[PDB]
């Protein structure tokens, strides 16, 4: 067979990358419940380095609940603080992944594969141990890096507008 | 003499001009309404959405600030037009966002990412009306440089900044 | 139902179809000459170069097998047309490469590289004429997927394989 | 100022990358003349790893003088053998950089910047210590890697056709 490099992104990789984020989120919440804040922040570090692209510079991360002075988490620390708190630089961050998440559903409205990047926009539904679901409007942009792994370079999350 | 060169990549200069042009279009739609009525404003918005968005390519990932849950995502040109100027019983909740007598637009980017052929910005946009009332949104834009060298919006996530 | 999806990336399937279509065009130009004359063949090549090359975007990086040093690089549609069908005193050395009664085309890729929106192939192409004489070239192609989803040749380096 | 990642390629980087290849070629030829085959093959290794993209898989390298059975050097070894010989797997390769090169001129006919890759086509003129110039028709494709460095992923070189 002919040797082929493939920097492009398929629809399959996009949907895997998206699922992988949910696995990562639940793993943090799960770890927090069983092993406490220490192991879970350790976990979330390997997650953010794996799933995000703070390697390349700023990530365009606007988290659902971030507040005016630190709305955009362009730093690896900004993301980790959103996910697990415990960073006096983000006083208002209690740790979004610490809410005992157990299930994540991705509901895409549209996907745009623009060469070696891909963008999804849709809903994400995260449900906890007691069944309380939360719903965000979400835009993800993945970049396929030199090693063939998708990396989050844009992450805009917002609470659905209501009346 | 100069080497002939085709350049499909986007430059920072191109991105910033594109954000600027959007704001200029927004105020043009609002200003045409106040000065010429719904018809002339709706007509301008059609040319605007056709010029600055990429619906030609397929869906645009447009999630507007104040769209409601059955029609959160405006993947259709008619969804984008309806959000801006209302007047479409297919989108009954749409009063016409661009009709609020807007007069100034301010782009404060927090980060820019040029993926080569595309470019994403994320930051704040601050629009202010005839009487000086300012609205701030958190916005993510994605611009594609088309075969003709024009940047088009293929992604547009707007949201009210979270509070309390 | 299916998620609406815009796909600007090139797939291996798309690349191979594109190489195949070029060979099919080549034999169509040669076969139209033998069966209809220069005029009909030149007319076909115009549609061919317009369909399969990307001169619309600017220069195409076309270096043909047997072009000579003042006009080595055919960056112009007229250069590409002249190389294929001659008949252009602007390119006096051009007898019309596609007029040699070609009948079969074989693509043997050595490597394929999909850069996302574009794709490059490098390998051999073996074209054979009405009487069974085969010519082998070392070819590099670059295909761009245009806003309409059609792969276009923006790079085309052909060369005689080196000997002794 | 606003933080910005820039995977794109500029015209300036293309022309720098091209010059850098020539520097690399002359460095090998120069080293060979003063320090022999050992230091120069060592040099050419760091060059091919630096300038080429055999990291990502096959490079589309068709060298000027490669012969029918091994026309395409899709392997790091294939390139090194073209440049400095000394590899029983490429018997016919005497080492193209071993010819005491001193000057390299790049004469571009066209450049195509297709996002985060760029393609040049033109002439290259390489002249040796005695002034004997050699002229190739050359196509280069550069990929800007996760670290911002251009890498050769396509390299088609051919002797100009004559009568």
Residue numbers in the entry:
A (entry chain B), D (entry chain B): 43 to 205
B (entry chain A), C (entry chain A): 42 to 205
Structure paper excerpt:
In the present study, we report a novel type of CAs that has been characterized in the eukaryotic microalga Bigelowiella natans and the cyanobacterium Anabaena sp. PCC7120. Taken together, these results suggested that the COG4337 proteins are metal-free enzymes that catalyze the hydration of CO2 to HCO3-, but not the reverse reaction. Each domain formed a cone-shaped barrel structure comprising three α-helices and a four-stranded antiparallel β-sheet, which were almost identical across the COG4337 domains of Bn86287 and all2909. We thus concluded that COG4337 proteins should be treated as a new variant of ι-class CAs.
To further analyze the metal-free catalytic mechanism of COG4337 proteins, crystal structures of Bn86287 and all2909 were determined. The substrate (bicarbonate) and inhibitor (iodide ion) were found in a bent finger-like cavity of the cone-shaped barrel. As expected from the biochemical assays described above, electron densities corresponding to metals were not detected in the cavity. Notably, Lys180 in all2909 was found at the analogous position of Tyr224/388/552 in Bn86287. To evaluate the functional importance of the cavity-forming residues, we performed point mutation analysis, wherein Thr106, Tyr124, Lys180, His197, and Ser199 were substituted by alanine in all2909, and Thr486, Tyr503, Tyr552, His584, and Ser586 were replaced by alanine using a recombinant protein of the third COG4337 domain (431–607 amino acids) in Bn86287. In all2909, the substitution of Lys180 did not affect the CA activity, while the other four mutations resulted in complete inactivation. Considering that hydroxyl groups of Thr106/159/322/486 (residue numbers in all2909/1st/2nd/3rd domain of Bn86287) and Tyr124/176/339/503 were found at a distance of 2.5 to 3.5 Å from an oxygen of HCO3- and at a distance of 3.2 to 3.7 Å from an iodide ion, these hydroxyl groups would most likely mediate the deprotonation of active site water. The deprotonation process could also be assisted by the main chain nitrogen of Thr106/159/322/486 and the hydroxyl group of Ser199/258/422/586 that is positioned within hydrogen bond distance to Thr106/159/322/486. The results of size exclusion chromatography with multi-angle static light scattering (SEC-MALS) system showed that Bn86287 exists as dimers but all2909 exists as tetramers in solution. Analysis with the PISA (Protein Interfaces, Surfaces and Assemblies) software estimated that a tetramer of all2909 was assembled by a head-to-head interaction of two dimeric units.
